[PDB]
Every structure is written in C-alpha cells, then in structure tokens.
C-alpha cells in the first residue's frame, strides 16, 4: 500500500536480527561489531583457533559464492512465510492424523 502510494519511505521493514547474529558466531566478515564478549577479538575463541575452522568456513561476506548471503528485511518475511507453511500444513496433518 505504501509503495505506489509513492511513499517508499514509511515502508515497514524489519531488518531481521536473529540470523545475522547467528553468523557472527561463525562470521566473516561484514563490518565488525564486537558483540560484547566476543569484541571482534581479544577474546577470540582461544581454546580453539588455527586448527579446525581455518580459512574454511571463512568465505566471509563474499558475494559470488560465500555460503552465507547477507540477509535483510526481504528475508525477514519469506522466512516467516515458510514458517506459516509447515504449521498450517501440519495443523491439518497433525489434525488429519489425530
């Protein structure tokens, strides 16, 4: 309704944390944060380091073929509309069954 109302602004979009946050834990790398008690280092992991995660599971941000692509308000909806699927689909299968 907003758009084509020609205010694009006054659009309502959530830039949807919860994922971006997962994938700090992993990383990298888009512009930092510390995230209190990681901090982008200092506390690094320390117990673990050069062994295991190396260069791997470090594409980081990487537009071309990262693994992890950089999620925003467009993805905070489909991701709630795949969620309204297996739920409705299952209230009917759960029910169907029960």
């Amino acid at each position: 309704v907003m758009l084509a109302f020609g205010t694009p602004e006054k659009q309502i979009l959530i830039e949807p944390i919860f994922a971006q946050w997962i994938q700090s834990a992993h990383g990298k790398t888009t512009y930092g944060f510390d995230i209190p008690l990681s901090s982008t280092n200092g506390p690094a992991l320390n117990a673990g380091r050069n062994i295991w995660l190396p260069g791997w599971l470090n594409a980081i941000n990487e537009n071309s073929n990262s693994l992890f692509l950089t999620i925003g308000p467009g993805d905070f909806l489909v991701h709630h509309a795949i969620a309204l699927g297996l739920h409705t689909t299952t209230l009917i299968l759960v029910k169907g069954a029960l």
């Binding site: 758009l3 084509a4 109302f5 020609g6 205010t7 694009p8 029910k95």
Partner: protein, 730 residues
C-alpha cells in the same frame, strides 16, 4: 404466531425468538440461521402458502430500486457538477482526460489523484456522463446540481410509493392476475412517450446547442438557459418553421428542403459521434411504434391458435399460469433483458451514439465490458429462476400435458444432442490453437493455420460485411457510407488526435476466436439447460424434487449423487460464463487496439496501438500471453507511485481474493467442523465460547462462498488489468 394474532396487537413484535420454518429457530441457539435469512430472505416457500401478497411485496422492492438508482446518480450527477472537470473539458474536449472524483488527502491517499484536467488533480473516469452529457446544451455546474436534486425528488416520492403499497393496507389479486392491458400502456406511452418525449428535448435544445458547439466558443458565449420556446429564431438555423407545410401531409413543396432529420449514416468529423441528427428522427420513428403497438388489445386467443404435428398442443394454454407464476415471468425476461444488454455492447463500439467516443477509447470499453457481464450475469440467472419454476411455484399439477410436458418427454434427448455439439467444438474449437504451439514450437509454418499458411489466401473480404457497406444498391437511399463505419467498404478519414473507426477487416484469427465463442457459449447452456430441465425428477433421483432446488447433494450412494440439483447447475454454469464473457472481453481489446485504435499522423499513416501484432500471433494461444497478458499488464505492474496506482494496488488483492476462493471451492465441511471444535475446546477452558453454537458452512453456503469470490476475485483483476492500459498510451 401469535405474538399476538390478529385483532388486538398494533403492538409490534420485536423479540421472543424469531422466525422460520415451524420448529422455528429453536429457541436454542445456532449460527447457521444468521447465514440463513440473508440468503433466502425471500424465497417464497415461506411467509405464505398463498401467493396472496407477494406480488404485493415485489412491487414495493421494485420501488426501492428505482429510488436508489435515483439516489445514485443524483450522486453521480452531483459529483459530475461540483467537482467539475466538465465545464473545463467541454470547451476543451480531446485535451482533457476527465474526473468527477477526488479523495481528500489522508495518509497515503492522494498518490491516487493525478492531473486529469482543465488544471485540477483527479481520478480519471471511465463511465461517460461528459458524454451522455454533451447533449445538455445550456450548461454549467449548479444545474446539473438541479438535474441532481430533481433526482432526489424522484426518490423519497418514488420511494414513498413503496410505503404507498405493501405497508399501506394495500392491494389484491385481480390487479396483476387480470393482466389484460399491461404491455398496453408500457410500450405504448413511455417506451413511446419516452423516445417520443426524448425527441422533444432532442432537437428542441440539444441539436442546436451542439450544432454550433462543434466549432468551440466558451459556452454561453452560446446558450441562454431558457431561450428555447415561442421564440424561435434559432430553429431557423437548423431549419424552418415549416414555412408552409400543415401537419406534414402533402400538398407541400420543397425546391430546397426536407425537415431536420435527413438521416446520417456515418460519423461527424471533429466530433465523431455520428450525426446528432438522425438521433431525433430515429427516436421519433420509434415511439410511433409503441404509440401504435401498445394499442393491443384486451389473451390466450393468439397463443391458443396455431398447432402443428411436432408442434405443441401445450402451446395453447401455454399457461393459464403464465399470469401467475412470477418466478417464470422473471426467468423469461432475464434471458431477454440480459441478452438484450450485450447486444448494446456491439452496436456501441461499432456505432458510437455519444459525441467524443472512440477517440475516448477507455471511456467506451470499460462500457463494452461492463455492459457484457450483465448480458451474461443476468442470463445464467434467467436459467436459475426457470429452475426455480421447474421445481416449485404452483400449488398443484394443473399445467398439464403440453409443449413442456412435451419438451420433457424428450429430455435425455434435447441434451443428448448439444453434448456432442460441444466435443465437436472444443476439438475444432480449442485444440485447433494447440496444433499451432505443438507445431510452431516444433516449428514448420508451412502447415500451421496461420492466416498466411493454410489456405484461404489474402482476402477476408466478401461475406456480409462487404455487402453491408456498399449498402445503397438498394431500396436503400441513404447517407454516404455505412450503417457502421467499420464495415469494409469506404473512408479513411475519422478523427483529430487519433483514429476512431475503420474497417477492422478480419480473415482467419477472427475466424477461430469467433468459434471458441461458439463452444464456450454452447457448453455454457448445456449445463444450465440440462440443469433446469432435469429440475424436479431424474433417472438418478426420482424422489429428487422433495425439499429442493438447493439441497447440497442427495447422498454418497448411487456412486456420486453430489452435484445434481440445479442451484449447482447454476453454480457450475456461472463458473463457465465467467469465461464466456472473460474471454470475449479478451477478444475485443486485443483486436480493437491491435487494429483500429489508432493514430492519425501526417498523411494519415495509421499507427495501431500495436502495429497489427494479431496477424500471425493470436493463433498461438501463447501469443495470447506473449502478445497479451505479458505484453499489456506491464502497465499494471509498472503502475506504482502514480495516480491510477489503485489498480496495480488492487490487482494484487482480488488477484488474491480469487486465490482464496479455491479454499472455499475445493474443500470438505465436517472438516472445518472437526477443526472448529479444537478451537471450541480451547475456547471453553478459559470459559469463552459455547453460546450460539458456532458451526461450519452450510455445504451449499460453502459453494456460495466459492464462486461469488472466484468471480469478484478473477474479475476485478482485469477491471484493474484494463484501466491501466487505456489510461496512458491508448
């Protein structure tokens, strides 16, 4: 019932729990009944056994509607006056792009309202007043503001005649069930005395006040407001005070005249309406008939007369009833009223009757599709209500042994044919297209069906169209061109931005749409015909008429025993017609723009909104989304942030509402029950439900909420798709 009968309560009943069928709404609570009762608020099984009133009710309901139109359209005519667009447009027509209607600016609203105008922000309109309107000559905004209240006058009064029936102590049988006059009157002096009366205010006043408008001025530089009587100098131009004739007749001389008239044929140049002057003559030449005609007569007389050997005994006393069925004398009507509306839809686009139409593209195709859905929405009805006859209306049998009793005699027969008719069509009427794909995608054009490839070779030309204009070999006299400009012979020349009107020559690729229509018109009707015919008793059920034209479905047995009935034949018959019309629309605009709707340019090189893409490319039924749906519609999905935008912004909803119908159309019923309780449970724990037993939808209500949505969904989708590809280029 008895709150309290007869004689001794004025005192009205509001309260104690209320009414229908005798184990009347229970007392004890339910939901369905709230859905019952809007539905089947009138059926007339119930209220009384005896027709008694109802004809005494249906006259009143009729009054309400006539008022209401009136409430309407005062509104319209308002709106049209005092949010003017109109004064501005008329000096200005063919520049203007016209509104009656404006929002107020609250929240988003106002993207909507984008400069239309003689300098004001608007929502552009495609029903034309402003074209009904041209006719008023006198002009100015405050009047239409009189024509407006003149509207609200007719209303209140043509709405206190509805008090002045049923509610007032009111009328009895003879008055309808002696018919004997009724068309006598109606057609004679109203059908007549309107068209007649319309003549008198269609040359008196209108002709002159656009005879010298078709030049310019700033109106009233031309027309005084009353100006037009004992007077008249002005008639003198536009012709004589009859100078010396007498009451027509002849011992009359013209060395140069013949009275206003003088027939037009073809279109005005610089207002291509068609001449404003055959418009008096034609209406005059109508009325007479009606004036003479509504002078029959009193009845069985004519109907009881001619009989034949196939032909029907029944034909005779083809219905004592007819006077009192009603449901039948409505069903007949709808077929006509209905089938007599979409005959408008042609004579309109191929012969405009208002100044500035065609040039005005979008403000007469809206029309040709609105008028088009009524000459269809009223026809399936015209079957439903016959089904409503075929089942119930008369107490008893005594129709007997006729013409009908005849038709039924065969019935697994009239519909036995009609069936094959359709599969003959369909195979010759759609897989025809599918050839093309399967073989143009295989790709070998040598052998398609293209207007070029499979040989008729390059003429359409001679059938009727070519005999029709070409018209004066004839006992025909008249008028430089055609009855309709489009017919093949004649003319480059029509109009001033733009093309209005030109041959349209067809060939093939007008050939086969014209045939899909056949098959679509036919299998529509199969289902309604067989539906209304097998109304009451069937080879699958005999005990079939017993509650219902409605009942859901008789029961799981006999194999299926579901759809049957005839509410449902008038449920699956709508389902088709939505196509019948939905694809006829799809036909006209793809033509009317692929060819015709135009532009003129120096040396008149015509530039069709699409250089005839139709040619080789409707024949492919993908071309129908290559060239249509994906081509045009790019204006619907570009329409954001604009002024019309409310179309693109609808086109998602209603392109949603449709894709919600299937849920109502495709689903069980004790399902949403089985669900509605899980609900009802959670409800009781908190203590929040039981009272008014919440119930799922009434098998057939569910079908009522299919269909109805499937249509107001699937339909306004294009109402949007359209107004969005004529506003703006085209």
């Amino acid at each position: 019932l008895v709150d309290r009968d007869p004689i001794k309560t004025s005192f009205e009943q509001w309260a104690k729990p209320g009414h229908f069928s005798r184990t009347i709404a229970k007392g004890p609570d339910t939901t369905t009944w709230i859905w019952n009762l809007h539905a089947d608020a009138h059926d007339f099984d119930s209220h009384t056994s005896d027709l008694e009133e109802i004809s005494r009710k249906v006259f009143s309901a009729h009054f309400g509607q006539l008022s209401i139109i009136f409430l309407w359209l005062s509104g319209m005519y308002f709106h049209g006056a005092r949010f003017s667009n109109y004064e501005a447009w008329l000096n200005d027509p063919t520049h203007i792009g016209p509104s009656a209607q404006v929002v107020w600016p609250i929240v988003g609203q106002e993207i909507l309202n984008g400069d239309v105008g003689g300098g004001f922000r608007g929502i552009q309109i495609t029903s034309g007043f402003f074209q009904i309107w041209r006719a008023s000559g006198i002009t100015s905004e405050l009047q239409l503001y009189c024509t407006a209240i003149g509207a609200l006058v007719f209303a209140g009064l043509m709405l206190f005649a509805g008090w002045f029936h049923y509610h007032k102590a009111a009328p009895k049988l003879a008055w309808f069930q002696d018919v004997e006059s009724m068309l006598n009157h109606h057609l004679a002096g109203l059908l007549g005395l309107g068209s007649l009366s319309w003549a008198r205010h269609q040359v008196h006043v209108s002709l002159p006040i656009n005879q010298f408008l078709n030049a310019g001025v700033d109106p009233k530089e031309i027309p005084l407001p009353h100006e037009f009587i004992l007077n008249r100098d002005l008639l003198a131009q536009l012709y004589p005070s009859f100078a010396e004739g007498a009451t027509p007749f002849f011992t009359l001389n013209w060395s140069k005249y013949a009275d206003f008239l003088t027939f037009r044929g073809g279109l005005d140049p610089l207002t291509g309406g068609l001449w404003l002057t055959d418009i008096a003559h034609h209406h005059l030449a109508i009325a007479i008939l009606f004036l003479i005609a509504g002078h029959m007569y009193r009845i069985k007389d004519i109907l009881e007369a001619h009989k034949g050997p196939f032909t029907g005994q029944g034909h005779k006393g083809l219905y004592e009833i007819l006077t009192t069925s009603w449901h039948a004398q409505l069903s007949i009507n709808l077929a006509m009223l209905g089938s007599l509306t979409i005959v408008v839809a042609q004579h309109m686009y191929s012969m405009p009757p208002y100044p500035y139409l065609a040039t005005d593209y979008a403000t007469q195709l809206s029309l040709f599709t609105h008028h088009m859905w009524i000459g269809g929405f009223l026809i399936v009805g015209a079957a439903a209500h016959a089904a409503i006859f075929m089942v119930r209306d008369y107490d008893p049998t005594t129709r007997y042994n006729d013409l009908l009793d005849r038709v039924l005699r065969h019935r697994d027969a009239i519909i036995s044919h009609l069936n094959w008719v359709c599969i003959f069509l369909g195979f010759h009427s759609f897989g025809l297209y599918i050839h093309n794909d399967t073989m143009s995608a295989l790709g070998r054009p040598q052998d398609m069906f293209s207007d070029t490839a499979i040989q008729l070779q390059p003429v359409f030309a001679q059938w009727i169209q070519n005999t029709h204009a070409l018209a004066p070999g004839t006992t025909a006299p008249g008028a430089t061109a055609s009855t309709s400009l489009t017919w093949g012979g004649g003319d480059l020349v029509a109009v001033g931005n733009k093309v209005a009107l030109l041959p349209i020559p067809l060939g093939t690729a007008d050939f086969l749409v014209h045939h899909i229509h056949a098959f679509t018109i036919h299998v529509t009707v199969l289902i309604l015909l067989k539906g209304v015919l097998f109304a009451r008793s069937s080879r699958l059920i005999p005990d079939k008429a017993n509650l219902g034209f409605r009942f859901p479905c008789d029961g799981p047995g006999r194999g299926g025993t579901c759809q049957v009935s005839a509410w449902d034949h008038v449920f699956l018959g709508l389902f088709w017609m939505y196509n019948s019309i939905s694809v006829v629309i799809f036909h006209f605009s793809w033509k009317m723009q692929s060819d015709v709707w135009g532009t003129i340019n120096d040396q008149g090189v015509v530039t069709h909104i699409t250089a005839g893409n139709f040619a080789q490319s409707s024949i492919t039924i993908n071309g129908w989304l290559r060239d249509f749906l994906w081509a045009q519609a790019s204006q619907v999905i570009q329409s954001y942030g604009s002024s019309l935008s409310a179309y693109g912004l609808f086109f998602l909803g209603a392109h949603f509402v449709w894709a919600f119908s299937l849920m109502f159309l495709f689903s069980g019923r004790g399902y949403w029950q089985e669900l509605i309780e899980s609900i009802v449970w959670a409800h009781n724990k908190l203590k929040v439900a039981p009272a008014t037993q919440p119930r799922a939808l009434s098998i057939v209500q569910g079908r009522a909420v299919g269909v109805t949505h499937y249509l107001l969904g699937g339909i306004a989708t294009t109402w949007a798709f359209f107004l969005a590809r004529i506003i703006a280029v085209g």
